Design a protein around this ligand. Structure first.
Ligand SMILES: *[C@@H]1O[C@H](CO)[C@@H](O[C@@H]2O[C@H](CO)[C@@H](O)[C@H](O)[C@H]2NC(C)=O)[C@H](O)[C@H]1NC(C)=O
Ligand SMILES: *[C@@H]1O[C@H](CO)[C@@H](O[C@@H]2O[C@H](CO)[C@@H](O)[C@H](O)[C@H]2NC(C)=O)[C@H](O)[C@H]1NC(C)=O
Ligand SMILES: *[C@@H]1O[C@H](CO)[C@@H](O[C@@H]2O[C@H](CO)[C@@H](O)[C@H](O)[C@H]2NC(C)=O)[C@H](O)[C@H]1NC(C)=O
Ligand SMILES: *[C@@H]1O[C@H](CO)[C@@H](O)[C@H](O)[C@H]1NC(C)=O
Ligand SMILES: *[C@@H]1O[C@H](CO)[C@@H](O)[C@H](O)[C@H]1NC(C)=O
Ligand SMILES: *[C@@H]1O[C@H](CO)[C@@H](O)[C@H](O)[C@H]1NC(C)=O
Lengths: 206, 289, 83
């Protein structure tokens, strides 16, 4: 029952203030009774003109309370409706690069679902699971050139240096197609000593 | 606020009359509670987006970046980063005066020391684990190899950082230093906060001072009208007090509702930044500054 | 059975030196829950479970496997129209 609390609250709070708006028809407001006619037929009208003030002054106020509520509450929904349009637009019709706008994890797609006076998104999000501690290095010397990964990072399980994509463990042997050359071996802090295999060199040897 | 007391102090005479306005007294509490509840929802949404409380490793080697400024201070009794103390001094009787008449200040659900544990966690995971802790289990990654990504995010190839690291270190640290004096030497930076706190304490003062206004009644002391005059007539007098005061609450309440709706909007802006900016890296130009 | 809090005078809930997830929010970190015979308790809320990332300048952890989770998210759109 609770996951809809956001909706269930909105429906409640309206009927709440709607109720309270109605009960205010039973209140004296200082006048001798809360029934309109029963003030009349009791008294001669030149007195009722006085009393019916304290009815009107009461009820008219109770509206402006209720009304001014709705306006405030309307804007509250208003901002929520704008957020729904933003999610409907970006999350469902796009793929949101924004983080945790569509929910925890990297976002794949959303499926909207209608609900009474509201909308319900089903966010399909990609959450990683099993991790393995890896020795890593930001760079790899080869000949004294430095090699950096195009995408991903140099890792090793402790012997063979592998470059892999970041959000999933998919090791690949390190070749020039994996790595680009910049600078040389002095500057980088943490560069290690390794050999970046070459696609082309063997292709020659015949 | 206690509606029956604030309106009618210590008088059943007035208290009975209030019943003739019905649910005003109750619906005000229903109103203010709606505010008071979501305030601890705001602070909930913003600060705690993280499943676990991370804590920085014992030894700090970030590649030259000095976070002792921003990390929790192990030597303070309430552990709060050196900077945060600069803030709590700038921002700031009203202690019991309000609390005389039924104006109560409820404690925020989360103590400041707890807020400083979240902002430690969020800051502990940001440093060690990169941005992945917002998407799941935090993943330790060398901080200098974090900043290689955050350059790829902005289009600067990572070979810039691996070469400029030492330089970037100093620019960072020397930038953090000036943040102290930016806060330390000027008290207007926090105006946004300072304005919120004032306006709250403002209306409370106004709300209190409304107790001393005649509102057309013969006096502002609820008992004097009862003391001097026979009730038959004093009834009509107390109306002008009640009608005046009871209205004067709805003014105050409506202000709070409106003002909270602003904060409610500002809170989402934080929770948006906290999620996108802190936990991730933002591609939105000038959203993060 | 009385206990003094930060938020006021609490009655009928046995203090607990242990600290668990905040369940029924009270004030200033005090959060109450029903479980242990049983009695309502009151305790300093633990914000989160605690972790310390194992971090060293060469240490990286790359996920080998993933899940695909579907997390419902619910928002109002309109409210009941009246005149
Ligand atoms: C790290 O991973 C590499 C890649 O598989 C391992 O190298 C292989 O290890 C297997 C062991 O069953 C051998 O059969 C292969 O011949 C190895 N291939 C290469 C290219 O070395 C390496 O053993 C792993 N090391 C650790 C400590 O996990
Ligand atoms: C990688 O190899 C280089 C040499 O190509 C190493 O640089 C020298 O290392 C020896 C110790 O084995 C030092 O005595 C020399 O002084 C180093 N070079 C110079 C010019 O001083 C390097 O230490 C090896 N390890 C790295 C850098 O990962
Ligand atoms: C980070 O900066 C702080 C100060 O901003 C350094 O703390 C200072 O350390 C020196 C030691 O040479 C002392 O003489 C100062 O009194 C310290 N100042 C304060 C305010 O504590 C800290 O050593 C720096 N650490 C790193 C790793 O950069
Ligand atoms: C990585 O090392 C830490 C060291 O404390 C250990 O707790 C953790 O379990 C290791 N990772 C895995 C997947 O076991
Ligand atoms: C990493 O930190 C260790 C300290 O445990 C240090 O011995 C080593 O030189 C550091 N390497 C780099 C590249 O910072
Ligand atoms: C918690 O421990 C202290 C001693 O450190 C003790 O005095 C106190 O009674 C304990 N609290 C409860 C609820 O038992």
């Amino acid at each position: 029952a609770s996951a809809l609390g956001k909706l269930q609250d909105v429906v409640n709070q309206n009927a709440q203030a709607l109720n309270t708006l109605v009960k205010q028809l039973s209140s004296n407001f200082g006048a001798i009774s809360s029934v309109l006619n029963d003030i009349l037929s009791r008294l001669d009208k030149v007195e009722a003109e006085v009393q019916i003030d304290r009815l009107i002054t009461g009820r008219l106020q109770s509206l402006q309370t209720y009304v001014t509520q709705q306006l405030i509450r309307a804007a509250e929904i208003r901002a929520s409706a704008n957020l729904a349009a933003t999610k409907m637009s970006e999350c469902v019709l796009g793929q949101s690069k924004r983080v945790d706008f569509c929910g925890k994890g990297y976002h794949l797609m959303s499926f909207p679902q209608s609900a009474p006076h509201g909308v319900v998104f089903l966010h399909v999000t990609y959450v990683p699971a099993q991790e393995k501690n890896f020795t890593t290095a930001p760079a790899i010397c080869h000949d004294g050139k430095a090699h950096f990964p195009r995408e991903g990072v140099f890792v090793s399980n402790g012997t063979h240096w592998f470059v892999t994509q970041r959000n999933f463990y998919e090791p690949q042997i390190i070749t020039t197609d994996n790595t680009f050359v910049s600078g040389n071996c002095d500057v980088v802090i943490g560069i290690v000593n390794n050999t970046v295999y070459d696609p082309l060199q063997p292709e020659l040897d015949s | 606020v206690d509606c029956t007391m604030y309106i009618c102090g210590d008088s059943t005479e007035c208290s009975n009359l209030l019943l003739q306005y019905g649910s005003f007294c109750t619906q005000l509490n229903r109103a203010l509670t709606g505010i008071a509840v979501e305030q601890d929802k705001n602070t909930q949404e913003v600060f705690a987006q993280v499943k676990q409380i991370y804590k920085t490793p014992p030894i700090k080697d970030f590649g030259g970046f000095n976070f002792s400024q921003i990390l929790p201070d192990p030597s303070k009794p309430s552990k709060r980063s050196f900077i945060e103390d600069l803030l709590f001094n700038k921002v700031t009787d009203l202690i019991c005066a309000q609390k005389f008449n039924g104006l109560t200040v409820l404690p925020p659900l989360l103590t400041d020391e707890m807020i400083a544990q979240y902002t430690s966690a969020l800051l502990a995971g940001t440093i060690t684990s990169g941005w992945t802790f917002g998407a799941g289990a935090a993943l330790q990654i060398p901080f200098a190899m974090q900043m290689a990504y955050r350059f790829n995010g902005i289009g600067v190839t990572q070979n810039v950082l691996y070469e400029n690291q030492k330089l970037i270190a100093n620019q960072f640290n020397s930038a953090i230093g000036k943040i102290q004096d930016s806060l330390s030497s000027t008290a207007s930076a926090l105006g946004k906060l300072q304005d919120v706190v004032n306006q709250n304490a403002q209306a409370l003062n106004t709300l209190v001072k409304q107790l001393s206004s005649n509102f057309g009644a013969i006096s502002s002391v609820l008992n004097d009208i009862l003391s001097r005059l026979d009730k038959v007539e004093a009834e009509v007098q107390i109306d002008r007090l009640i009608t005046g005061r009871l209205q004067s609450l709805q003014t105050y309440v409506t202000q709070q509702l409106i003002r909270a709706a602003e904060i409610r909007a500002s809170a989402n802006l934080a929770a948006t930044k906290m999620s996108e900016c802190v936990l991730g890296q933002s591609k939105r130009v000038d959203f993060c500054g | 059975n009385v206990f003094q809090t930060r938020a006021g005078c609490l009655i009928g809930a046995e203090h607990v030196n242990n600290s668990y997830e905040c369940d029924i929010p009270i004030g200033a970190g005090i959060c109450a829950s029903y479980q242990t015979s049983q009695s309502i308790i009151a305790y300093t809320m633990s914000l989160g479970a605690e972790n310390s990332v194992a971090y060293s300048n060469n240490s990286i952890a790359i996920p080998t496997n993933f899940t695909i989770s579907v997390t419902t998210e619910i928002l109002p759109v309109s409210m009941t129209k009246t005149s």
